[PDB]
Design a protein around this ligand. Structure first.
Ligand SMILES: *[C@@H]1O[C@H](CO)[C@@H](O[C@@H]2O[C@H](CO)[C@@H](O[C@@H]3O[C@H](CO[C@H]4O[C@H](CO)[C@@H](O)[C@H](O)[C@@H]4O)[C@@H](O)[C@H](O[C@H]4O[C@H](CO)[C@@H](O)[C@H](O)[C@@H]4O)[C@@H]3O[C@@H]3OC[C@@H](O)[C@H](O)[C@H]3O)[C@H](O)[C@H]2NC(C)=O)[C@H](O[C@@H]2O[C@@H](C)[C@@H](O)[C@@H](O)[C@@H]2O)[C@H]1NC(C)=O
Ligand SMILES: *[C@@H]1O[C@H](CO)[C@@H](O[C@@H]2O[C@H](CO)[C@@H](O[C@@H]3O[C@H](CO[C@H]4O[C@H](CO)[C@@H](O)[C@H](O)[C@@H]4O)[C@@H](O)[C@H](O[C@H]4O[C@H](CO)[C@@H](O)[C@H](O)[C@@H]4O)[C@@H]3O[C@@H]3OC[C@@H](O)[C@H](O)[C@H]3O)[C@H](O)[C@H]2NC(C)=O)[C@H](O[C@@H]2O[C@@H](C)[C@@H](O)[C@@H](O)[C@@H]2O)[C@H]1NC(C)=O
Ligand SMILES: *[C@@H]1O[C@H](CO)[C@@H](O[C@@H]2O[C@H](CO)[C@@H](O[C@@H]3O[C@H](CO)[C@@H](O)[C@H](O)[C@@H]3O[C@@H]3OC[C@@H](O)[C@H](O)[C@H]3O)[C@H](O)[C@H]2NC(C)=O)[C@H](O[C@@H]2O[C@@H](C)[C@@H](O)[C@@H](O)[C@@H]2O)[C@H]1NC(C)=O
Ligand SMILES: *[C@@H]1O[C@H](CO)[C@@H](O[C@@H]2O[C@H](CO)[C@@H](O[C@@H]3O[C@H](CO)[C@@H](O)[C@H](O)[C@@H]3O[C@@H]3OC[C@@H](O)[C@H](O)[C@H]3O)[C@H](O)[C@H]2NC(C)=O)[C@H](O[C@@H]2O[C@@H](C)[C@@H](O)[C@@H](O)[C@@H]2O)[C@H]1NC(C)=O
Ligand SMILES: *[C@@H]1O[C@H](CO)[C@@H](O[C@@H]2O[C@H](CO)[C@@H](O)[C@H](O)[C@H]2NC(C)=O)[C@H](O)[C@H]1NC(C)=O
Ligand SMILES: *[C@@H]1O[C@H](CO)[C@@H](O[C@@H]2O[C@H](CO)[C@@H](O)[C@H](O)[C@H]2NC(C)=O)[C@H](O)[C@H]1NC(C)=O
Ligand code: NAG
Ligand code: NAG
Ligand code: NAG
Ligand code: NAG
Ligand code: NAG
Ligand code: NAG
Ligand code: NAG
Ligand code: NAG
Ligand code: NAG
Ligand code: NAG
Ligand code: NAG
Ligand code: NAG
Ligand code: NTZ
Ligand code: NTZ
Ligand code: ZN
Lengths: 499, 499
C-alpha cells in the first residue's frame, strides 16, 4: 500500500523510498523543453512569440525578456544532450520551431535545409545516448507570416499549412522519432492568446485589454480552439495514413488541472467544479473522444460554439494514439456570473466559475507554487494529489487512454542568487510529491501512464515571465549561457532515475 | 571667392567664417534619422531588419546589436524634438515604419491606429517648433510578412502594397507633411540586400555567402532595383494625381558618391570611373530622367537587365519633384574583370571597377572616415570636395534638379568613453568641411540645393555595426537612453545655425 504526502514537509526525496524502480521497467523518465524558450532566433525566421514579445514588451515578462538568445540551445544542443546523459534520462521532449524549418510558413515557399540539419543532429545525438525523443510539432511559435496573412489559427487556412509542415517533419525525422505531439496544451492559445491576450498573438476585446491590436475575447477562443482541433486531427490522419511504416505514435498535449469544490457541501460550488472539468478538459477531450463538444458548452456557448460537420467529427474523434498530459496544479471552483452581453466578456467566463487556491473555510490547497509579488492573494499553490485525480479521471471518463506526462515542474524566483538557485529543495519536493502520487495512481487505478517528463531541462525564457523565474533542473547563468549545471533537483532526479 | 579645405587641419568650425547666413535665407538646416534605427519594436509589427538581425546576428553588428530598443524614440520622441529645438533646426528627416502603421503589410488587413497617432504627435510637435518634416516612406524596414509572402521587392506584388501604404501616409499625414521621400538610397537594398547579403533581407548566391537563405547575386539586384523604380514611380504618380491639393513635393533618395580615377592619366582607370558613375548613379538616374537604363548597363548586363514597357518608362521618367541626395564619401576607380560565369558573380562586378581610397601613386583621398580594425587597408577615407563634384554633376547631367542633402555625417568608435565621444571634433571637421563645399557649389555652379540634413540626430542602431559606432550630433547612453545630449558637434551646429 502506497502512502503519499500532500503537505510539507515531504520525505519523498529519499531515493530509498521512491525511485524509478518503483515504476514499471519500461517507464520513461526525462525532461522537457520548447523551442522558443531555449533555442534563440539565430538561424530561423520570426514567429508570433518574437512578434508578441517585441510589440508588447511588458507582456513578455517584468524584465521585458524574450527568446532572442535565451540559453542558446541552437549552439549548445550538445550540452542539452549532456544533461540528459548525466541524468540517465530515457526521454526528452523538445519542440520543433516551425520558423526554423519553414521560415516562410507555407511549405511550398521552401524549406531551411540548415534548420532541418539542426534537428537531425539533435535527434541523432539523443538516440546515440539512448534517449527517446518526444517531439512537439507546435509549441505556440507560429511563423509571423501566417499570423499576418490570415491571423493564424483564427482562420481555417491554418489547417493545410500546419498539415504540410507536419508532413515535412514526418518525412524528415519520423524514421527516428516515434513519439509526436501535435499542439502543446490545446487550452492555452485560445484562452491566453485570443481571450486574455496574456500570450501571443495578443488578441482580445478592446475593453479586456486596450493594447490588443484586434480581437474578440468572447468568440475568438472558440474559433481558434476549433481550428486547433481540426488541424490536429488532419495531422493525426496524415500520420496514421501516410507514415504508418514508421511505427510511431502521435497525440495532442492537454494542460490538465484538477478541480475541487470551493465549498464541498455547497451544490452550487460542486456544480461549478463539474462545469470546470467540462469547460477546461472536455472542451478538447469531448471532441477527441466523441467528435462533439460537451453538452454544457453547447448549451452555454450557443451560437458562439462552432459545429463539426459529420466528416470533421469523424476526423477529430479518436485522433490520438496517446495523450500528452501536462499537469502543474489544481483549483477550487465556486460559482461566478457569465455576463455574455458585457463588452469585457471572455470565453473563460462561460464556465460560470471563479477559481481559487483557498477554499471557503480558508484552507490553502497545498504548498506554494508561485508567489505573485504584486498581489500575494493571487499566489498559486500546488496539490500533489491532483495528478492522481487527473489520471484517474482520464482513465474513467476518457476511455482508458495511453498517457505520457509531458510536463510537470515548478519555478523558483530569478531574484535568488546562484547558490540559492542551485539549492532548489522546493523543486525536489514538488517533483517527488507528484511522482509519488503518479506511482500510486498507476498501481491503484491501473492508469496506462508510460512516462514522465519534468519541466524543464534547464533554465530558459519562461512565457510571460522572461528570466524572472527559473524552471530548470539544471542552472544556466544568463551572463554566460554555455553550461547547464545540475541543481540539487537535477542531482536528486539523477539518483531517482538510477538509485 | 570661396576657398574650402580638403585636408586636415580644417578651420571651418569657426562660425565667424562659415555659418547658416553664408547660405540663402530660406535654406533648411537640420538632421536625419530612420525608424528602425531609433524607435524600437514596441508598438509595431516585425520587419525584415528585425528578421535579418535576429536570424543572422553576426551581420547585425560585431556586438550583435539590433533595433529592438535602441534609443527608444517610440517613448522619447519629444526628446528628439527637444534636440531639434535646441539646435534651432528648420528641418528634420525621419522615416515612417511601415510595420508600425500596417503591421500586416497589406493595407486591407487593417491599420494600427495607435501607430498612426504616434506619427501624428511627432509631426504636430515638429511643426509647433517650426521644424519642417522630411518624411521617408521606406527606410528599408519592410514588413516581414511581405518578404515571406513574396520575397518583398523581388516580386512585382510589392508595387501595389507599397502604393497602398504610401496612400495611407499621404491621407493621414500629408495635410502637414510637405516633403516626402519614397525609398531611401535606391542603390543599397539591391546590392547589399540581394547582392552581398550584408543587409536585410540577406539573399545572395550560395558561393557569395553560404549563410544566405536563397538568392542570386547576379540577377536579383537588377530585379529588385527595377521593382524599386516602379514602386517609387507608382507612388509619385499617386501623390501627384491624388494629393496635389496638399501642396507638397516628393522624390526618391539616392546614395551619391563621387568617383575619381585611381590613375588619372590611365585611360582604363578613367573609363572605369565613368562606368562607375553610370552603374552607381545612372542605374537609377537614367530611369528617373529618361525612362531607360544607361546604355553601358544595357550592353554589359544584357538579359539580366529588365526592360521597361512604354507605359512603365513613362511612369518612371520624371517621377520626382526633387531629389534627396545622401553623400558620405568618394572612391577611386580602376579596372576590374567582370566574370559573369563565375558562381560568385555579383551585379556589383558588372561595372568592371575596383574601388579604393588610395590612388596609384599612394595618395589617400582625404581624412579618415571609418577605421576597419579587422583590416586597416580597408579603412574608408572622406573627400569634402566630393559633395561639390556630385552636386555639379547632378545639375549638369540630370537636368538641374531641386536637391535636398538628406544625409551627410561620420561615425566615431563605440569603444570611446563618454567624454571622448562628446569631444567629437572629428565630426565638426567632417560636417563643416562638407558644408563649405556645399555653399561653394551653390554659389559657383548655381546648383538648386535648398537644404541640408546631417546624419544623425542622435546615436542609434547603425545598420551592420550595432552600437559599435556612433553617428549622432547628440549622445545617448545605452544604459539609460532617455537623454540626448548635444556633443561638441551638436553645439557647433547650433552656433552654425544661429551664429
Ligand atoms: C456524443 O456524440 C453524440 C452524437 O454523435 C451525442 O449525441 C447527440 O446529442 C445531441 C445533443 O447534443 C442530440 O441532438 C439533439 O437531437 C434532438 C433530436 O433530433 C432528432 O429528432 C429531432 C428531435 O425532435 C430533429 O429536429 C432532428 O433533425 C433529429 O431527427 C435535437 O433538437 C437537439 O437539437 C436542439 O439542441 C441542440 C443543442 O443540443 C441545438 O444546437 C439545436 O439547435 C436544437 O436547439 C439535438 O439536435 C442537434 O442539434 C444541433 C445540430 O447541429 C445537430 O446535428 C443535431 O443533432 C443527438 O440526437 C445525439 N445523437 C445521437 C446519435 O444520440 C452525444 O451526446 C450525449 O449523449 C446524448 C444522448 C445526449 O445526452 C447529449 O446531451 C450528451 O452530450 C455525445 N456524447 C457526449 C458525452 O458528449
Ligand atoms: C533615352 O531614352 C531613349 C529612348 O526613349 C534612348 O534612345 C533609344 O536608344 C536605344 C538604344 O538603347 C535605341 O534603340 C536601338 O534601336 C536600334 C534601331 O531600331 C529601330 O530600327 C531598328 C534599327 O535597325 C529595328 O529593329 C527597331 O525595331 C527600330 O525600328 C536597335 O537595334 C537597338 O537594339 C539592339 O540594341 C539593344 C541594346 O541597345 C538590344 O537590347 C536589342 O536586342 C538590340 O540588340 C536598339 O533597339 C532597342 O532594342 C531593345 C528594345 O527593348 C527597345 O525597345 C529597342 O528600342 C532607340 O532607337 C533610341 N530611341 C530613340 C527614340 O532615339 C536614349 O538612348 C541614348 O541616346 C540614343 C540615341 C543612343 O545613343 C543610346 O545609346 C543613348 O543611351 C536614352 N538616353 C540616355 C541618355 O540613356
Ligand atoms: C458551505 O456551503 C454551505 C451550504 O451553502 C454553507 O451553509 C449554509 O450557510 C448559509 C449562510 O451562508 C446558511 O443560511 C443562513 O442560515 C441562518 C439560519 O436561518 C440565517 O439567519 C441566514 O439568513 C441564512 O439563511 C439563508 O438566507 C438566504 C436564503 O436565500 C436561504 O434560503 C437561507 O438558507 C445555511 O443554513 C447553511 N446551510 C447548511 C446546510 O448548513 C456553509 O456555511 C457555513 O456553515 C453554515 C452552517 C454557517 O455557519 C455559515 O456561517 C458558514 O459560512 C458554507 N461553508 C463555508 C465555510 O462557507
Ligand atoms: C599611370 O598610368 C600610366 C599609363 O598607364 C602609367 O604609365 C605607364 O606605365 C607603364 C608601366 O606600368 C609604362 O610601360 C612600361 O614602359 C617601359 C619602357 O618601355 C617598359 O620596359 C615596360 O615593359 C612597360 O611597357 C609596357 O609593357 C606592356 C605593354 O603591353 C605596353 O605596350 C608597354 O607600354 C608606360 O610607358 C607608361 N605610360 C606612359 C604614357 O608613361 C603610370 O606608371 C607610372 O609612370 C610610368 C612612366 C612608370 O614610371 C611606371 O613605373 C609608374 O608606375 C601610372 N602611374 C602610376 C603611379 O601607377
Ligand atoms: C463579439 O463578436 C460577437 C459576435 O459577432 C458580438 O456579439 C454580437 O453582438 C452583436 C451586436 O450586439 C449582436 O447583434 C449579436 O446578438 C451578438 N451575437 C452573439 C453571438 O453574442 C460581440 O459584440 C463582439 N464583442 C466585441 C467586444 O466586439
Ligand atoms: C543566376 O540566375 C542566372 C539566370 O537564371 C543563372 O545564369 C544562367 O545560368 C544558366 C545555367 O548556366 C544559364 O543557362 C544561362 O545562360 C545563364 N543566364 C544568364 C542570363 O547568365 C545563374 O547561374 C544563377 N546564378 C546562381 C549562382 O544561381
Ligand atoms: C527503490 O524504492 C523501492 C520502493 O519503491 C525500494 O524497495 C528499493 O530498495 C529502492 N531502490 C534503491 C536502490 O534504493
Ligand atoms: C504596458 O504596455 C502597453 C502598451 O503595449 C500599455 O498599454 C500598458 O499600460 C503598459 N502597462 C503598464 C502596467 O504600464
Ligand atoms: C498522402 O500522401 C499522398 C502523396 O503525397 C497525398 O497526396 C495524400 O493525399 C496524402 N494523405 C493524407 C493526409 O491522407
Ligand atoms: C469587467 O470585468 C472586470 C474584470 O473581469 C470587472 O472588474 C468589471 O466589473 C467588469 N465591468 C462590467 C461593466 O461588468
Ligand atoms: C563561459 O562558460 C564556459 C563554460 O563554463 C567557459 O568555458 C567559458 O570560458 C566562459 N566564458 C566566460 C567569459 O566566462
Ligand atoms: C543507467 O540506467 C540503467 C537502467 O536502469 C542502469 O542499468 C545503468 O547502470 C545506469 N547508468 C548510470 C551511469 O547510472
Ligand atoms: C557668417 O559667416 C559670414 C561668412 O560666410 C560672415 O560674413 C558673418 O559675419 C558670419 N556671421 C556671424 C554672426 O558671425
Ligand atoms: C556568422 O554566422 C553565420 C551563420 O549565420 C556563419 O555562417 C558564419 O560563419 C559566422 N561568421 C563568422 C565570422 O564566424
Ligand atoms: C486615385 O484615388 C482614387 C480613389 O480612391 C483611385 O481609385 C484612383 O485609381 C487613384 N489614382 C492614382 C494612383 O492615380
Ligand atoms: C570569387 O570571388 C572572390 C571574391 O569576389 C575571390 O576571392 C575568388 O577569386 C573568386 N573565385 C573564382 C573561382 O573566381
Ligand atoms: C535616466 O536618465 C534620465 C535622464 O537623465 C534620468 O532622469 C533618470 O533618473 C535616469 N535613470 C537612471 C536609473 O539612471
Ligand atoms: C532662431 O533662428 C532664427 C532665424 O535665423 C533667429 O532669428 C532666432 O534668433 C534663433 N533663435 C535662437 C534661440 O537661436
Ligand atoms: O509555466 C511553466 C510551463 C511553460 O514554460 C511551458 O511552455 C508551458 O507548456 C506551460 N504551461 N503551464 N506551465 N508551463
Ligand atoms: O552609415 C551611416 C548611414 C546609415 O545609418 C543610414 O541608415 C543609411 O541611409 C546610410 N547610408 N550610408 N550611410 N548611412
Ligand atoms: Zn529582439
Amino acid at each position: 500500500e502506497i502512502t503519499c504526502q500532500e503537505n510539507l514537509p515531504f520525505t519523498c526525496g529519499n531515493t530509498d523510498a521512491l525511485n524509478s524502480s518503483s515504476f514499471s521497467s519500461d517507464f520513461i523518465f526525462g525532461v522537457a523543453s520548447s523551442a522558443y524558450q531555449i533555442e534563440g532566433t539565430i538561424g530561423r525566421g520570426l514567429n508570433i512569440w518574437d512578434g508578441f514579445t517585441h510589440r508588447y514588451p511588458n507582456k513578455s515578462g517584468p524584465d521585458h525578456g524574450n527568446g532572442d538568445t535565451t540559453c542558446d540551445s541552437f549552439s549548445y544542443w550538445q550540452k542539452d544532450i549532456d544533461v540528459l546523459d548525466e541524468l540517465n534520462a530515457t526521454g526528452y521532449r523538445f519542440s520543433i520551431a516551425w520558423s526554423r524549418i519553414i521560415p516562410r510558413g507555407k511549405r511550398s515557399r521552401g524549406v531551411n535545409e540548415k534548420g532541418i540539419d539542426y534537428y537531425h543532429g539533435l535527434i541523432s545525438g539523443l538516440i546515440k545516448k539512448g534517449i527517446t525523443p518526444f517531439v512537439t510539432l507546435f509549441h505556440w511559435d507560429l511563423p509571423q507570416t501566417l499570423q499576418d496573412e490570415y491571423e493564424g489559427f483564427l482562420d481555417p487556412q491554418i489547417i493545410d499549412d500546419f498539415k504540410d509542415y507536419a508532413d515535412l517533419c514526418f518525412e524528415e525525422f519520423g524514421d527516428s522519432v516515434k513519439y509526436w505531439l501535435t499542439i502543446n496544451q490545446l487550452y492555452s492559445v485560445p484562452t491566453r492568446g485570443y481571450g486574455s491576450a496574456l500570450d501571443a498573438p495578443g488578441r482580445c476585446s478592446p475593453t479586456v485589454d486596450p493594447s490588443c491590436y484586434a480581437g474578440n475575447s468572447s468568440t475568438e477562443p472558440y474559433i481558434v480552439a476549433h481550428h486547433q482541433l481540426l488541424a490536429h486531427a488532419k495531422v493525426v490522419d496524415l500520420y496514421r495514413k501516410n507514415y504508418t511504416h514508421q511505427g510511431g505514435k502521435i497525440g495532442p498535449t492537454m494542460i490538465t488541472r484538477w478541480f475541487l469544490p470551493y465549498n464541498d457541501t455547497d451544490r452550487h460550488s460542486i456544480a461549478a467544479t463539474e462545469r470546470m472539468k467540462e469547460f477546461f478538459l472536455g472542451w478538447f477531450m469531448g471532441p477527441l473522444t466523441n467528435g462533439t463538444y460537451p453538452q454544457i458548452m453547447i448549451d452555454t456557448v450557443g451560437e458562439r460554439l462552432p459545429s463539426f460537420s459529420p466528416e470533421e467529427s469523424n476526423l477529430v474523434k479518436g485522433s490520438y494514439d496517446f495523450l500528452g498530459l501536462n499537469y502543474y496544479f489544481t483549483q477550487y471552483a465556486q460559482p461566478s456570473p457569465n455576463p455574455v452581453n458585457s463588452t469585457n466578456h471572455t470565453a473563460m467566463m462561460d464556465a460560470g466559475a471563479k477559481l481559487t487556491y483557498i477554499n471557503a473555510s480558508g484552507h490553502y490547497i497545498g504548498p506554494l507554487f508561485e508567489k505573485d509579488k504584486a498581489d500575494s492573494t493571487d499566489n498559486i499553490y500546488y496539490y500533489p494529489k491532483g495528478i492522481y485525480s487527473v489520471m484517474d479521471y482520464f482513465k474513467n471518463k476518457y476511455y482508458n487512454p495511453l498517457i505520457y506526462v509531458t510536463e510537470n515542474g515548478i519555478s523558483t524566483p530569478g531574484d535568488e542568487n546562484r547558490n540559492q538557485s542551485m539549492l532548489d529543495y522546493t523543486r525536489i519536493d514538488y517533483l517527488c510529491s507528484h511522482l509519488c502520487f503518479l506511482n500510486k495512481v498507476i498501481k491503484e487505478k491501473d492508469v496506462n501512464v508510460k512516462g514522465y517528463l519534468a519541466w524543464a531541462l534547464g533554465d530558459n525564457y519562461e512565457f510571460n515571465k522572461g528570466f524572472t523565474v527559473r524552471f530548470g533542473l539544471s542552472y544556466i547563468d544568463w551572463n554566460n549561457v554555455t553550461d547547464r549545471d545540475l541543481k540539487k533537483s537535477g542531482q536528486w532526479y539523477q539518483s531517482f532515475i538510477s538509485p
